[PDB]
Amino acid sequence: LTDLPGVGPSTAEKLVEAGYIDFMKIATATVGELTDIEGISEKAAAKMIMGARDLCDLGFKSGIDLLKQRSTVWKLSTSSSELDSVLGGGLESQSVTEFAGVFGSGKTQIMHQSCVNLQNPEFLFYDEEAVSKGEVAQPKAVYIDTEGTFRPERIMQMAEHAGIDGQTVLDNTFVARAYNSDMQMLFAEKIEDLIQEGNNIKLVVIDSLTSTFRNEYTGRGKLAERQQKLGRHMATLNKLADLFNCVVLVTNQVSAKAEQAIGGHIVGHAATFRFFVRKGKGDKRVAKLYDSPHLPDAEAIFRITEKGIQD
Ligand SMILES: Nc1ncnc2c1ncn2[C@@H]1O[C@H](COP(=O)(O)OP(=O)(O)NP(=O)(O)O)[C@@H](O)[C@H]1O
Ligand SMILES: [K+]
Ligand SMILES: [K+]
Ligand SMILES: [K+]
Ligand SMILES: [Mg+2]
Ligand SMILES: [Mg+2]
């Protein structure tokens, strides 16, 4: 912290107490959020922000540097060959990928499978030149369970079939049972603390993303209220994915209104990748990518079995 212009040992102590220890956290802060701290003046706040942006070299980039920035994105396999292909390799870090679909389509299964796959080094695809082995070492997941459907037994079973130690996954996966949108958002905001505590959070799951909000802001005369709160939550999720270079996954429910993911416009804009998961015959499922910034729409066929997601 004292490497930052204007920051002395006293100021550093204040910055850490307020949770600002990472250079990126400071480089992307506002004089306001910084001035809310004790003896941190506006000139001081401003100087350290500029310094941090500088140290993190956050300026104009062109040419090959654009490819290099894009190479810092690593991807997590879904265990499905077709889904990984439709995703352009796998689930992208630094982005929010949404899986929406009818009940039983497998949204929660995908979330569990991802927590298991995170513990298999061979399922994290990345360019060694842009992402070092250390950056993805001892990765951990955060599962924010909004409906109470987290199942340790499923994690174990999926792991065993993958040749992974079930307990190992449980030991490296943090679960937070949120009973409402307030807890849901607060937990998401506290993921920073788990990292500050030395936990390499590389996967964040929000299952479900919208169920709490829909139940709390029913009267369509309070819809604006809902969209606003939901928007702050999405922003927090997007920022955390970028700063901590981890993949963020969210599940969403659907309405008839042939259907559409709930959450309205705010969710549509904030989600980087959007899927619609359908049920085929028996254990067959179909994930339809219908929104992404660089990939074409496509469908991936897979199955949900005792082994989890496969094919
Ligand atoms: N151990 C298992 N063996 C085989 N199939 C399983 C197993 N566990 C779950 N499934 C399948 O997973 C389906 C449910 O998956 P689930 O992830 O809960 O869907 P969902 O989209 O999250 N549902 P919802 O949250 O209500 O909208 C089941 O109905 C089973 O067919
Ligand atoms: K300094
Ligand atoms: K259900
Ligand atoms: K459910
Ligand atoms: Mg991003
Ligand atoms: Mg579910």
UniProtKB/Swiss-Prot annotation:
The keyword DNA damage applies. One of its GO terms (molecular function) is damaged DNA binding. It comes from the Archaea. ATP binds at residues 101-108. The keyword RNA-binding does not apply. Belongs to the eukaryotic RecA-like protein family. This is DNA repair and recombination protein RadA. The lineage of its organism: Archaea, Methanobacteriati, Methanobacteriota, Methanomada group, Methanococci. The gene is radA.
